[model samples]
Target: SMKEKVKAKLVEIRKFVPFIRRVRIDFQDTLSKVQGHRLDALVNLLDREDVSMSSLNKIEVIIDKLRTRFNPR
Candidate 1:
């Protein structure tokens, strides 16, 4: 059950970080290793009006909770 929950959360996060090469959208050097795939996905989702708002909102809350509760102390 715990694995299921974690996997679901990770899948939700992945949707927001859709593509693997997101940093190239703005960076001149498209091949830079530091390109943020996570940031890129969120930007793409946010740009579209049709994106699942509930999904994004839930993910935002989940991530915030993780930051508050799941991090190593």
Candidate 2:
């Protein structure tokens, strides 16, 4: 059930990250990677692209939840 909870957390990220491909919505991670894949790993796919360089600047409190491997509710 926690995974889904983790999956739930991704909603906010997906809304923000959006798409870097095709339509202007939902980054590649925000879709598949966010749920089935690693959470903190958003850096690998998103960080590589300079486009997401600015938005990912929030992990201390905002994005940190997903990064902590579901440490926070």
Candidate 3:
């Protein structure tokens, strides 16, 4: 299911190439390493018409939330 999500994300990411490439990130490589809720959140964020490197902060926060949510020590 994660792979599917990533695959679907790859397709969705194509439209954002200009935005991503301008930011100097290889969208496919980045997405390829993403997994779980982080990937999910990233994909959702990428759905917007304004995704860019600036979006990384949001994804970082999402991942931080996930870490806090799952690993309560």
Candidate 4:
């Protein structure tokens, strides 16, 4: 059941991304009109000039971890 496996994976990814992005967007949006609608802001926040390279590396690691966890069979 490749389709079912793919569907489950899609759900897993969908679930995680919103939860992670919600915190990110909440800070960027002044009034939170859009709870989690700031992918650009998320990127910018993660890439802030003063943050450690380790922090950037951590984000890349998280991206891989989430993608691996959610990959479709």
> On a 0 to 100 scale, what is the lDDT of residue 19 in model 3?
38
lDDT of 3 at 25: 42
Candidates' TM-scores? 0.32, 0.27, 0.31, 0.34
lDDT of every model, 2 decimals? 0.49, 0.40, 0.47, 0.49
State the lDDT of candidate 1 residue by residue for 31-65, as single tens digits.
Answer: 34543454455555555444454665665774455
lDDT, candidate 4, 1-73, per-residue tens: 6556544444443444554565454455553555334444545554334444454456556666544543323
Best by lDDT: 4
Which runs of model 1 end up more than 4 angstroms from their true locations? 1-35, 62-73
Best by TM-score: 4
Alpha-carbon shift of residue 42 in model 4 (angstroms)? 6.1
For residue 35, give model 4's deviation from the true position in Å.
15
Give the runs in model 3 whose Cα sits over 4 Å from its true position: 1-51
Cα deviation in Å at residue 28, candidate 2? 21
List model 3 lDDT by residue over 1-73, tens digit each.
Answer: 6555555544554564343333224334444444433454555666665444445445545545544544233
Candidate 3 Cα lDDT to native: 0.47
